[PDB]
Amino acid sequence: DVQLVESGLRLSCAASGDIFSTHIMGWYRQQRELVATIDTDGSTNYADSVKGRFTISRDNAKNTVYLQMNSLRPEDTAVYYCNAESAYSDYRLPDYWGQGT
Amino acid sequence: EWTYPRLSCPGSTFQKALLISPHRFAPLIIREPFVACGPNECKHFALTHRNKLRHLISVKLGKIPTVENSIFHMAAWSGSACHDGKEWTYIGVDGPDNNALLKVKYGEAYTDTYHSYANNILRTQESACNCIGGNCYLMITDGSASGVSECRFLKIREGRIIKEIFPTGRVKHTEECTCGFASNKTIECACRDNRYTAKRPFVKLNVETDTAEIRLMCTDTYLDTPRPNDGSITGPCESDGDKGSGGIKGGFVHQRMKSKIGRWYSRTMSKTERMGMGLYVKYGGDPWADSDALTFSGVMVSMKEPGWYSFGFEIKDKKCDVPCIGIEMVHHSAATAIYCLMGSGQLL
Amino acid sequence: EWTYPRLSCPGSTFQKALLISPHRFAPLIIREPFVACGPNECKHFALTHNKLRHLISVKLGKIPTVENSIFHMAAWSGSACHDGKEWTYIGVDGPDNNALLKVKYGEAYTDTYHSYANNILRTQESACNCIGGNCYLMITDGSASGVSECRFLKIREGRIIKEIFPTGRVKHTEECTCGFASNKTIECACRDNRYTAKRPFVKLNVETDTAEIRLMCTDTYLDTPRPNDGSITGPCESDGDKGSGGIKGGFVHQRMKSKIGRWYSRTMSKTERMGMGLYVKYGGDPWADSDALTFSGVMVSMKEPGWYSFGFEIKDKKCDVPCIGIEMVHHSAATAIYCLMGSGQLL
Amino acid sequence: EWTYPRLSCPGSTFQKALLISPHRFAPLIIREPFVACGPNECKHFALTHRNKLRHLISVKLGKIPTVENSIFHMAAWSGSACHDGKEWTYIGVDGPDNNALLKVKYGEAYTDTYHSYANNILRTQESACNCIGGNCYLMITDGSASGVSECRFLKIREGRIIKEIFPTGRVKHTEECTCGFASNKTIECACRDNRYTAKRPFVKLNVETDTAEIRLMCTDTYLDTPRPNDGSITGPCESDGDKGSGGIKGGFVHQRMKSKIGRWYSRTMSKTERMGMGLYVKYGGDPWADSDALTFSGVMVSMKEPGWYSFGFEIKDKKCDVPCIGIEMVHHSAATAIYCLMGSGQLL
Amino acid sequence: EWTYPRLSCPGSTFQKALLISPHRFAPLIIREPFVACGPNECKHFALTHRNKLRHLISVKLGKIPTVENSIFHMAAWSGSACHDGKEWTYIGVDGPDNNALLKVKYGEAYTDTYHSYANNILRTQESACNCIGGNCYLMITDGSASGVSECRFLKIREGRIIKEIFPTGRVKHTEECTCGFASNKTIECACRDNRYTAKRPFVKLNVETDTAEIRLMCTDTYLDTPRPNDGSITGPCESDGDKGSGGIKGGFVHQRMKSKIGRWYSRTMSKTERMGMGLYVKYGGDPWADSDALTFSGVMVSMKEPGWYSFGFEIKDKKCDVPCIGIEMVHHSAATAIYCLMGSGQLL
Ligand SMILES: *[C@@H]1O[C@H](CO)[C@@H](O)[C@H](O)[C@H]1NC(C)=O
Ligand SMILES: *[C@@H]1O[C@H](CO)[C@@H](O)[C@H](O)[C@H]1NC(C)=O
Ligand SMILES: *[C@@H]1O[C@H](CO)[C@@H](O)[C@H](O)[C@H]1NC(C)=O
Ligand SMILES: *[C@@H]1O[C@H](CO)[C@@H](O)[C@H](O)[C@H]1NC(C)=O
- CATH code for position A36: 2.60.40.10
| Alpha-carbon gap, residue B124 to B176, rounded angstroms | 7
Distance between alpha carbon E236 and the CA centroid of its chain, in Å?
28
| Alpha-carbon gap, residue B244 to B248, rounded angstroms | 12
Q: Answer yes or no: do B63 and E71 touch at CB < 8 A.
A: yes
Give the phi and the psi of residue A61 in degrees, each rounded to 5: -70, -45
CB-count burial class (<10 Å; 0-12, 13-18, 19+) for E201: buried
E strand map for D55-167: 55-60, 71-74, 79-83, 88-94, 101-106, 109-115, 122-123, 130-132, 135-143, 149-157, 160-165
Contact E142, E120 (CB under 8 A): yes
Query: Which atom of ligand 2 lies at the shortest distance from residue C5's CA?
Result: 14
Residues with CB under 6 A from ligand 3: D 4-6, 183-184, 256
| Alpha-carbon gap, residue E13 to E336, rounded angstroms | 20
Q: What angle do CA E166, E172, E177 make, to 5 degrees?
A: 70
- Distance in Å, CA D183 to ligand 3 centroid: 8
Longest dimension (CA), chain E: 57
| Alpha-carbon gap, residue E225 to E194, rounded angstroms | 10
Resolution (A): 3.6
Question: Is residue B324 classed as helix, strand or coil in its secondary structure?
Answer: strand
Give the dihedral of Cα atoms B15, B20, B25, B28; nearest 10 deg: -160
Distances (CA, A) of D65 to B284, D36, D45, D72, E70: 59, 16, 9, 11, 19
Domain of residue A43, residue span: 4-85
Contact B14, B279 (CB under 8 A): yes
| Alpha-carbon gap, residue C190 to C170, rounded angstroms | 12
| Alpha-carbon gap, residue E347 to E12, rounded angstroms | 9
Could you tell me how many CB contacts below 8 A there are between chain D and chain E? 69
| Alpha-carbon gap, residue B88 to B223, rounded angstroms | 32
The secondary element (H helix, E strand) that includes residue B180 is strand B175-180
CA nearest ligand 2 atom 8, residue: C6
CA-closest candidate to residue B55, choices B77, B33, B86: B77
| Alpha-carbon gap, residue B150 to B214, rounded angstroms | 11
| A100 occurs within a structural domain | no
Contact C63, C22 (CB under 8 A): yes
Distances (CA, A) of C212 to C170, C187, C202, D41: 9, 10, 6, 42
Contact B198, B226 (CB under 8 A): yes
Contact B331, B20 (CB under 8 A): no
Contact A15, A64 (CB under 8 A): yes
Question: Which amino acid, residue D70?
Answer: S
CA-closest candidate to residue A28, choices A10, A9, A1, A6: A6
Query: Is cis: bond before B323, omega within 30 of 0?
Result: no
Q: Answer yes or no: do E94 and B16 touch at CB < 8 A.
A: yes
Sign of CA dihedral B127, B130, B136, B139: negative
B13 in contact with ligand 1, CB cutoff 6 A = no
| Alpha-carbon gap, residue C322 to C317, rounded angstroms | 14
Contact C94, D348 (CB under 8 A): yes
Which of the 8 DSSP states describes residue B292?
P
Q: What angle do CA D278, D279, D282 make, to 5 degrees?
A: 150
Question: Which amino acid, residue B3?
Answer: T
| A55 occurs within a structural domain | yes
Contact D192, D175 (CB under 8 A): yes
Q: No. of H helices and E strands in chain D?
A: 0, 26
Question: Is residue C157 classed as helix, strand or coil in its secondary structure?
Answer: coil
Name beta bridge partners: E261.
Answer: E256
Contact C328, C305 (CB under 8 A): yes
Q: No. of H helices and E strands in chain E?
A: 0, 25
In this structure, the number of other CB atoms found within 10 A of the CB of residue E283 comes to 10
| Alpha-carbon gap, residue C113 to C139, rounded angstroms | 10
In this structure, the number of other CB atoms found within 10 A of the CB of residue D110 comes to 29
C303 touches chain B (CB under 8 A): no
Q: Answer yes or no: do C109 and D41 touch at CB < 8 A.
A: no
Contact D280, D157 (CB under 8 A): no
Distances (CA, A) of E25 to B80, E65, E333, E338: 40, 11, 12, 19
| Alpha-carbon gap, residue B66 to B56, rounded angstroms | 14
- Distance in Å, CA D242 to ligand 2 centroid: 73
Sign of CA dihedral E242, E243, E246, E249: negative
E18 touches chain D (CB under 8 A): yes
- Cα within 13 Å of Cα(D147), Cβ side: 9
Report the length, in residues, of chain D: 348
CA-closest candidate to residue B44, choices B335, B248, B305: B335
Q: Which of C28, C73, C110, C155 to mutate to test the interface with D (most CBs of D within 10 A)?
A: C110
Query: Which atom of ligand 4 lies at the shortest distance from residue E6's CA?
Result: 14
Distance between alpha carbon D37 and the CA centroid of its chain, in Å?
14
Name beta bridge partners: E89.
Answer: E82, E106
Name beta bridge partners: B314.
Answer: B323
| Alpha-carbon gap, residue D175 to D143, rounded angstroms | 10
CA-closest candidate to residue E107, choices E70, E73, E68, E61: E73
Q: Say which residues have a Cβ less than 8 Å from residue A77's Cβ, sequence separation at least 6.
A: none
| A98 occurs within a structural domain | no
Give the phi and the psi of residue C316 in degrees, each rounded to 5: -90, 170
| Alpha-carbon gap, residue A6 to B335, rounded angstroms | 42
Contact E44, E70 (CB under 8 A): no
CA-closest candidate to residue E324, choices E333, E337, E335: E337
Q: Which of residues 42-61 of C touch B (CB under 8 A)?
A: 42, 59, 61
In chain E, the domains with their CATH numbers are: 14-341 (2.120.10.10)
CA-closest candidate to residue B62, choices E40, E105, E62: E105
Query: Which atom of ligand 3 lies at the shortest distance from residue D256's CA?
Result: 13
For chain A, what is the domain count? Answer: 1
Q: Say which residues have a Cβ less than 8 Å from residue D304's Cβ, sequence separation at least 6.
A: none
Nearest to A21 among B146, B248, B272 (CB): B272
Distances (CA, A) of D109 to B172, D89, D95, E44: 67, 11, 20, 15
Question: Is residue B37 classed as helix, strand or coil in its secondary structure?
Answer: strand
Q: Say which residues have a Cβ less than 8 Å from residue A51's Cβ, sequence separation at least 6.
A: none
Which of the 8 DSSP states describes residue E113?
E
| Alpha-carbon gap, residue B65 to B302, rounded angstroms | 26
Contact E20, E33 (CB under 8 A): no
| Alpha-carbon gap, residue B171 to B164, rounded angstroms | 15
| Alpha-carbon gap, residue D274 to D276, rounded angstroms | 7
CB-count burial class (<10 Å; 0-12, 13-18, 19+) for C191: buried
CA-closest candidate to residue A50, choices A63, A62, A67: A67
CA-closest candidate to residue E204, choices E236, E167, E172, E176: E167
| Alpha-carbon gap, residue D245 to D247, rounded angstroms | 7
Contact B328, B310 (CB under 8 A): yes
Here the contacts of D270-275 (C-beta below 8 Å, separation 24 or greater) are: D270/D225, D271/D225, D271/D226, D271/D227, D271/D228, D271/D229, D272/D225, D272/D226, D273/D225, D273/D226, D274/D225, D274/D248, D274/D306, D274/D307, D274/D308, D275/D303, D275/D305, D275/D306, D275/D307
Subunits close to E (at least 3 CB pairs below 8 A): B, D
Query: Which atom of ligand 2 lies at the shortest distance from residue C182's CA?
Result: 13
Q: Answer yes or no: do E101 and B348 touch at CB < 8 A.
A: yes
| Alpha-carbon gap, residue D17 to C74, rounded angstroms | 7
| Alpha-carbon gap, residue B70 to C62, rounded angstroms | 8
| A42 occurs within a structural domain | yes
B198 touches chain E (CB under 8 A): no
Q: Order of strands, edge to edge, in the sheet holding A24-29?
A: A44-46, A33-38, A24-29, A80-85
E304 touches chain D (CB under 8 A): no
Q: Say which residues have a Cβ less than 8 Å from residue E15's Cβ, sequence separation at least 6.
A: D101, D103, D110, D113, E339, E340, E341, E342, E343, E347, E348
| Alpha-carbon gap, residue B21 to E52, rounded angstroms | 12
Sign of CA dihedral C124, C128, C131, C136: positive
| Alpha-carbon gap, residue C204 to B90, rounded angstroms | 39
Question: Is residue A50 classed as helix, strand or coil in its secondary structure?
Answer: helix
Contact A83, A97 (CB under 8 A): yes
Nearest to A18 among B144, B245, B248 (CB): B245
Sign of CA dihedral C292, C298, C300, C301: positive
Which of the 8 DSSP states describes residue B318?
S
| Alpha-carbon gap, residue E16 to E348, rounded angstroms | 9
Distances (CA, A) of C206 to A5, A10, C164, C186, C259: 80, 91, 10, 7, 20
| Alpha-carbon gap, residue C306 to C328, rounded angstroms | 6
| Alpha-carbon gap, residue B115 to B99, rounded angstroms | 8
Q: Say which residues have a Cβ less than 8 Å from residue D219's Cβ, sequence separation at least 6.
A: D282, D287, D290, D291, D292, D293, D294
A-chain CB neighbours of B144 within 8 Å are 92
Nearest to B109 among C63, C316, C342 (CB): C316
